[PDB]
Subunit: 251 residues, 4 copies
């Protein structure tokens, strides 16, 4: 049968691009989403029109809480319930906003969302994925090429993405005896936030040596597809920057 | 007016050495503890014998929870109460134990303790330290030289220490305009766990190129003292390995 | 028109596998060799049997000397003379042997180890770029996953490979305006030396988390093919580890 | 008896401040220089006026060539000749200029930039180790911007990367002899002699910590730490002294 993949935060933007590319490659997909129900259902509809019974949606909040482990177990279970297997996990869902150190949400809510989505949920999903297991099993974590030259006032987000690098390495080591590879893809500037005005987008665009433009969602998805493929069967613990040289540019 | 320092987890082992060496350098010190009340007090007694009213203690659990931000505010407050200023924060307190990915603390308790002590508490203490502020202000975070070659089955602990590296860099960037430096000290093998088998201890000792032995607590403290000193006033965002070459040794 | 690639040290082992996969993908190839003339010719004849006039050989010593710049220019010029174009350069040729700190003179060792692993790649990169100034131009440098946990007594080899990482980053930045991408592939343990006893090969194989085996030459080649492909069009300055997790394993 | 240190490129700027600071700490010093003879001799005069017989100069070209090993052996030998011992080596001398990929030959640029920044440190390390209570160590002056390099400085960057590799390899291999090997990595410190207020202030405003360059003395302070008894478990470590520069995105 066809293999099956879970993509977190897959309703739009880079997560959609990944789910679409996995689907085009032959995977059945679980489209996880949090708030973007209409978009997630519209995506599953398109994929199922292309090949019937190959896409399902799965709603979950990935904020840290005492029930997050159950939520993550349920996401993996949703892939087994729909498709009878789960070959690939892509940890894409991410909260992203500033948390200034010196002066809406309480700080503990900010911790829970920013560390939950970027690090704890990937950890719990990785535990569940491994516990439920020819084969080409792997996990791909969406990291950040700018983790060591971070945006000002984004400490909790940056902490979250560092922890995710840690996870990628720890889980690669620990899951290797089970034949589960664990890798990352690290965008620099890809799709800019929808709220950002064009002038500010262009400022970011002009920082990128390779073409003075952001990565397309497809360009990010391409590196994901490589890492899940048979062409990466000896690669584990590796994080591939997809940044057009941005991380190499000094202040 | 002598400067004042907060050292978390300062009752025993490396935290104690750091507190002692800061005191010997002329600092007044807050000795934070969780369970080691008798030891913390015994340390403060020894230090106040040398110099009267230059050491106090402060109890707090640094597990993440709804009350952690208040507990961290009060640690910083205890330094301002006792001494009228707070020049140095040392984030040393740390939970450490395995959290295997594949199979009586629940996983979310493990998250709260390992991520709370190694990363969230340092973030919250950093916030409180900064908000409450010629001077030589700095923060020193106790990291881990082996973050990129982690111990097997220590994912959460490793995620915690990676997040602490992220905080070190983010806070160095953001707090530099206030003259607050933020740095790290990364031990390799220092004081081995009290519980560990003596023959296990020697296996780790034999791995160290420089001397085939662990670092003393004083050797770790030595790097801390350098970082807080006037001879490090241009250093921020730096993490100093104190590992006798261990991290350079291949498998 | 079919694109063309230069592969240095392509007669045997990993370089051979790279040349073969590039050819299978549709490239015309220049097979550079130093001493392995019979193997190089055997490869060219095998490839030209598949498609006539698609493989040539080129001989050169890549040891550093007064004539190295000329030799590197000529290698690049051979691709243009043979094929009318040069789209891809793979810097694969490498001297490798110990140089302890405590019959070749030391300056010969410097010339060979730094020449092949670093200087020749730099001069080849200059010549490649000078001859340029639809298309997908890129350079791929064969690096080493173990560069930060080096083999004992291999200082000059390790220096060479570090210089090569530096060149990969510097050239990525500088050549990005010309649309030339520059990346690396970093093996850990791949094909072990031919004369090495199996019992010694096994000590290395047993260190690899993912399968307790070395990478095949084709597995290394797969990563090269990705980097040169249309699926890596935003990737520059990136070094892909292909190491089965070896570099994450502590001593 | 006083320990002794070799400092390469010690006539001016950062190397000079390192030599002065080691001397203040109690070391006898060899002041290596290439072209700065007057500044070198002037410095040794100053130092020897403070404590007699505690500074010598030693001239050498550290460009790579078939005689570089001899020149490097001679630098180390000069320390033993003057002082009967060699406790510390500081690899500070460095050529620095652009080598774009697209009136010196390219092989001269390779020789100078890779020689001074990497090969000479390697040969000096070999000679130092072969000639060997004690606290023996080597400190290499690296570069905090090695992973965000200046445009068109490929050979220089290659040199400094190779110097990181040397720092790690030599730390590993020399640990069984008790020789520690470490680095200090400036970001922006004393700006080039040829550079205007606009361009100097351009670099200054990039630095988070004070919007200024490091003083030479601030770089020397980290060197002093690493050679000290307070760093006896530290080997293979590189200390950035950059005021946060390397943390700032494009
Ligand atoms: N875009 C870039 O330039 C860039 C740069 C560096 C790294 N990255 C990384 O690449 C990945 C994709 O980036 P992106 O810009 O496409 O992401 P994004 O649009 O910011 O977020 C992707 C999805 O994350 C999900 N999410 C957010 N909070 C959540 C929560 N509490 N629970 C569950 N899901 C939640 C949302 O799902 P709903 O919409 O369903 O609510 C959202 O669509 C992320 O991991 C990101 O950090 C992106
Ligand atoms: N020892 C090593 O070889 C080594 C190696 C690498 C890194 N490090 C790092 O260096 C630092 C010191 O190491 P160490 O071995 O001295 O540490 P440790 O003995 O494991 O722990 C230090 C203190 O942390 C405090 N702590 C633990 N859980 C806590 C909680 N939930 N709330 C508040 N405080 C808590 C404890 O205080 P109470 O006793 O008062 O409960 C404990 O005494 C740590 O950050 C560690 O990760 C050490
Ligand atoms: N095999 C591994 O496990 C491993 C591990 C880490 C990194 N790598 C890297 O991957 C690449 C390929 O590895 P490999 O094991 O296949 O390499 P290799 O067999 O050791 O060397 C490849 C070729 O390098 C050429 N070469 C050597 N000295 C030369 C000189 N002075 N001038 C010109 N060419 C010279 C030789 O060509 P002739 O035979 O024609 O003389 C040789 O066949 C190298 O860059 C290597 O450092 C390999
Ligand atoms: N200044 C900074 O901002 C900065 C930033 C990053 C890294 N660094 C590193 O810190 C160290 C000192 O920096 P600096 O700016 O003080 O250095 P510098 O003034 O550029 O150079 C120091 C000395 O190196 C010597 N030198 C140059 N070419 C030589 C050769 N062929 N043979 C022998 N010696 C040679 C020169 O000696 P003579 O004058 O006697 O000819 C020169 O005085 C260097 O390793 C540098 O790369 C500095
Ligand atoms: N979840 C998530 N969404 C994002 N838009 C980002 C970005 C990003 C990167 C560049 C930019 F100008 C704005 C945001 C960086 N990291 C992100 N993570
Ligand atoms: N908080 C804390 N306590 C510790 N004992 C450690 C160690 C450590 C390091 C080496 C070893 F053999 C056992 C434990 C590593 N990291 C630690 N963190
Ligand atoms: N040019 C070149 N050839 C090689 N055989 C190597 C190796 C390698 C890696 C493992 C081993 F046991 C022996 C050599 C590591 N790096 C290399 N480079
Ligand atoms: N030998 C040597 N000399 C230097 N002046 C440098 C610098 C440097 C750093 C900043 C700047 F604006 C100009 C030069 C960076 N690296 C150097 N190396």
């Amino acid at each position: 049968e066809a293999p099956a993949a879970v993509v977190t935060g897959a309703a739009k933007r880079i997560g959609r691009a990944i789910a679409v590319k996995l689907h085009q490659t032959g995977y059945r997909v679980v489209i996880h989403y949090h708030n973007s129900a209409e978009a997630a259902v519209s995506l599953a509809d398109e994929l199922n029109k292309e090949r019937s019974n190959t896409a399902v949606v799965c709603q979950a909040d990935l904020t840290n809480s005492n029930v997050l482990p159950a939520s993550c177990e349920e996401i993996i279970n949703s892939c087994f319930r729909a498709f009878g297997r789960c070959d690939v996990l892509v940890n894409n869902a991410s909260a992203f906003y500033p948390t200034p150190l010196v002066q809406g949400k309480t700080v503990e809510t900010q911790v829970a969302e920013l560390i939950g989505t970027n690090a704890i949920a990937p950890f719990l999903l990785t535990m569940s994925f491994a516990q439920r297991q020819s084969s080409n099993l792997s996990i791909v974590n969406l990291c950040d090429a700018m983790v060591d030259q971070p945006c000002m006032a984004f400490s909790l987000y940056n902490m979250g993405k560092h922890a995710l690098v840690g996870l990628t390495q720890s889980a690669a080591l620990e899951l290797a005896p089970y034949g589960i590879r664990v890798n990352g893809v690290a965008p620099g500037v890809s799709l800019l936030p929808v709220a950002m005005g064009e002038e500010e987008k262009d400022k970011w665009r002009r920082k990128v040596p390779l073409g003075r433009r952001e990565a397309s969602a497809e360009q990010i998805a391409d590196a994901v597809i490589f890492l899940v493929s048979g062409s990466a069967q000896y690669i584990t613990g590796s994080i591939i920057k997809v940044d057009g040289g941005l991380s190499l540019v000094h202040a």
